Amino acid sequence: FLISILEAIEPEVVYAGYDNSQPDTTNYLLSSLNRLAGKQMVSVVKWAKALPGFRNLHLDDQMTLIQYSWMSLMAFSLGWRSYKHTNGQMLYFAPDLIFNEERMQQSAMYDLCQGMRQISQEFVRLQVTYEEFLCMKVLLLLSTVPKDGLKSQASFDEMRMNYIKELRRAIENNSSQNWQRFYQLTKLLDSMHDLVGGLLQFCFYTFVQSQALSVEFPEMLVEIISDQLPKVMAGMAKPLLFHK
């Protein structure tokens, strides 16, 4: 019933608190997304703590893991929402902030938007199930680690394997077909890294010139990014891939 749990701790929908009466300038669009991100951050943290096995890890690791994977978690959840609500035609950031063709253009990050829409499309092509999605999401939280290692390395390794097995369980069907499914689903997981690399590059770029660009970031994000940025630029993080 490990999934029964994943299903119960799955965060409730988060609204952007977006004001459509405002002009959709690049500044307002990005600042609004950053606000949504701050609100989603709170939800991912509360979700992580309720994750069977996450609390067994050292606090330092818990901090490090969320710090390195928050962008991937949110982009992936965005992929799912866009899949269930628009069959992947639009980015369902939040019920009150749906990105259509127009907002993608005025956002100044059209390409990153398409990259994110591509994840949504994969969900469509593969008809990913809700259970597969929940398991994959957890794996994401456990796929970007410090090159030097975690403090609860052993506790970490066990947890990761358990969720990988949980994914297999979600995956009736014959053995070969289940193998092919696993291969394809883990290919999707590995693809997140390139997408995230690009998402993070723009995030760091807008973060550095925040005031000069008039792109706002909520306090919680400012602290996370401020600490994370140098670590990423220093190549301190590495992905845990499923494929060559």
């Binding site: 509360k46 606090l59 818990q62 901090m63 969320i66 710090q67 919680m220 602290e223 996370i224």
Partner: peptide
């Protein structure tokens, strides 16, 4: 990440 740490340890 002050706000985050405080949120994770409670």
């Amino acid at each position: 990440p002050a706000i985050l740490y405080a949120l994770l340890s409670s």
